[PDB]
């Protein structure tokens, strides 16, 4: 429960206060915010709770204290690789993503834990998702911010999907759990999902491969568009 995981990282409130201080320094924000109070609402969101008993309503004071107007049309959905998703948003800083949003710039590459009894950070151990339980607060936060960002996405989506695994599009990811259900086809029309031939591909007949053919099988019964440009 508590154990069998890597715990909280070192210098947690100093890196939270520094990170978004760089955000109100570099970006002239549409409200200049109290970076200290952001961390107090973050502390009240999860602190001294049971790791595998965390729901989504604990995090909405943070999400209503971080209300951005993420520009629609210029959006990007990522999955699988993080380094090439980082290089694709470094070539694509016009098209804003979850590693360019305020809340992703707050809690990017961070994990947190906390023992249930008293006010302390559990620095040593961590609730893993498969091995302990999938209600840990890091996956709660990433589910909430990918739901809000994929709901307010609009016009043209450009998903990067690697093929280094045998499962190119796995069903049980956050992409195929909340993102492709709330892609909202009244404002999105065309979906240029960009399959990657990097790594080790499962099969030939690329773009006739079976999991991206299952996504080419249109989930929306309005039958909004699907497309699949490749990267060799």
């Amino acid at each position, epitope marked *: 429960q508590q154990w069998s995981g890597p715990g909280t990282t070192k210098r947690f409130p100093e890196t939270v206060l520094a990170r978004c201080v760089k955000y109100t*320094e*570099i*970006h*002239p*924000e*549409m*409200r*200049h915010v109290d970076c200290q109070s952001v961390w107090d609402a973050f502390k009240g969101a999860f602190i001294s709770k049971h790791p595998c008993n965390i729901t989504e309503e604990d995090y909405q004071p943070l999400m*209503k204290l971080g*209300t951005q*107007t993420v520009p629609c049309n210029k959006i990007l959905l990522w999955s699988r690789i993080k380094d090439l998703a980082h290089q694709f948003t470094q070539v694509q800083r016009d098209m804003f993503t979850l590693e360019d949003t305020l809340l992703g710039y707050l809690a990017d590459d961070l994990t947190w834990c906390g023992e249930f009894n008293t006010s302390k950070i559990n620095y040593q151990s961590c609730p893993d998702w498969r091995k302990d339980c999938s209600n840990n607060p890091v996956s709660v936060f990433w589910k909430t911010v990918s739901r809000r960002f994929a709901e307010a996405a609009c016009d043209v989506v450009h998903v990067m999907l690697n093929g280094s695994r045998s499962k190119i599009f796995d069903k049980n990811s956050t992409f195929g759990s909340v993102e492709v259900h709330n892609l909202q086809p009244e404002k999105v029309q065309t979906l240029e999902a960009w399959v990657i031939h990097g790594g080790r591909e499962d099969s030939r007949d690329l773009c006739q491969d079976p999991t991206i053919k299952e996504l080419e099988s249109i989930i929306s019964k309005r039958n909004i568009q699907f497309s699949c440009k490749n990267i060799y």
Partner: antibody, heavy 118, light 112 residues
Framework: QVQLVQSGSELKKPGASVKVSCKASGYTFTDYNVHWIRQAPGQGLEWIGYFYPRNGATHYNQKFTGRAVLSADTSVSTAYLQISSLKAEDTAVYFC???????????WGQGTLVTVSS | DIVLTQSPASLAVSPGQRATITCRASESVDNFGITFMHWYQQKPGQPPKLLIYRASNLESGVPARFSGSGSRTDFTLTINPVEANDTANYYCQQSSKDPRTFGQGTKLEIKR
């Protein structure tokens, strides 16, 4: 097309409270900010402070703190400004301004001359 | 704040010739890869139509006569083919720190 339209000229007494009102047309109101910018006549320009109409989140300049109380209405799509307890040196022209970010101003209102005398 | 003062106080240029309306910051406005220096052209009886913002970007709808170069100290605004309808004030404006004070202006007039 995107446009802005603000209220007309006002002759104020010393001690009175100005209430400038704009009106945003051509675009959805919840996306961008509504700044305010001064012009004393024959002089330079001076920033006041900007409103955020998504959740009511204001931010003023350090000189105009307390005097300036920004507000809006999300249904009627009108921005606001209020400076109270006026005096004779504060006769100027104010403009409502939308920026693409904070730190730019492409779109403007037409101008409002307020004059303080008795 | 940051206090900025416009270094040519006036100009009188006949058309077909060039002009230079510069200003000088007290410190660096250029931090972390952004510089904030935004010039603004203001004719009388007209609120300022936006010019070169973040020291490079000519806005769409503005003519391509204008060429503005911003830095950490020196901010020139040169107009090479000046015309008869350019009789306006040319403010500068920074936005690096949270005080967002402007310049003070420069009365450009046309020599005839």
């Amino acid at each position: 097309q995107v446009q802005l339209v603000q209220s007309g000229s006002e002759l104020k007494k010393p001690g009175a409270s100005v209430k400038v009102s704009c009106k945003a047309s051509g675009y959805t109101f919840t996306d961008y900010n509504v700044h305010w910018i001064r012009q004393a006549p024959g002089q330079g320009l001076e920033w006041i402070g900007y409103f955020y109409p998504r959740n009511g989140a204001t931010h003023y300049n350090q000189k105009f703190t307390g005097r300036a109380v920004l507000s809006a209405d999300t249904s009627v799509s009108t921005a606001y400004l209020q400076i109270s307890s006026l005096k004779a040196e504060d006769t100027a022209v104010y403009f409502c301004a939308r920026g693409e970010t904070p730190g730019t101003f492409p779109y403007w209102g037409q101008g409002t001359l307020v004059t303080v005398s008795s | 704040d940051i206090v900025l003062t416009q270094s040519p106080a006036s100009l009188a240029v006949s058309p077909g010739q060039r002009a230079t309306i510069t200003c000088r910051a007290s410190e660096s406005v250029d931090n972390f890869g952004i510089t904030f220096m935004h010039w603004y052209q203001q004719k009388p009886g007209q609120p300022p139509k936006l010019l070169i913002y973040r020291a490079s970007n000519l806005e769409s709808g503005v003519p391509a006569r204008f060429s503005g170069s911003g830095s950490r100290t020196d901010f020139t605004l040169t107009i090479n083919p000046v015309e008869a309808n350019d009789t306006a004030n040319y403010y500068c404006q920074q936005s690096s720190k949270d005080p967002r004070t402007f310049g003070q202006g420069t009365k450009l007039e046309i020599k005839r």
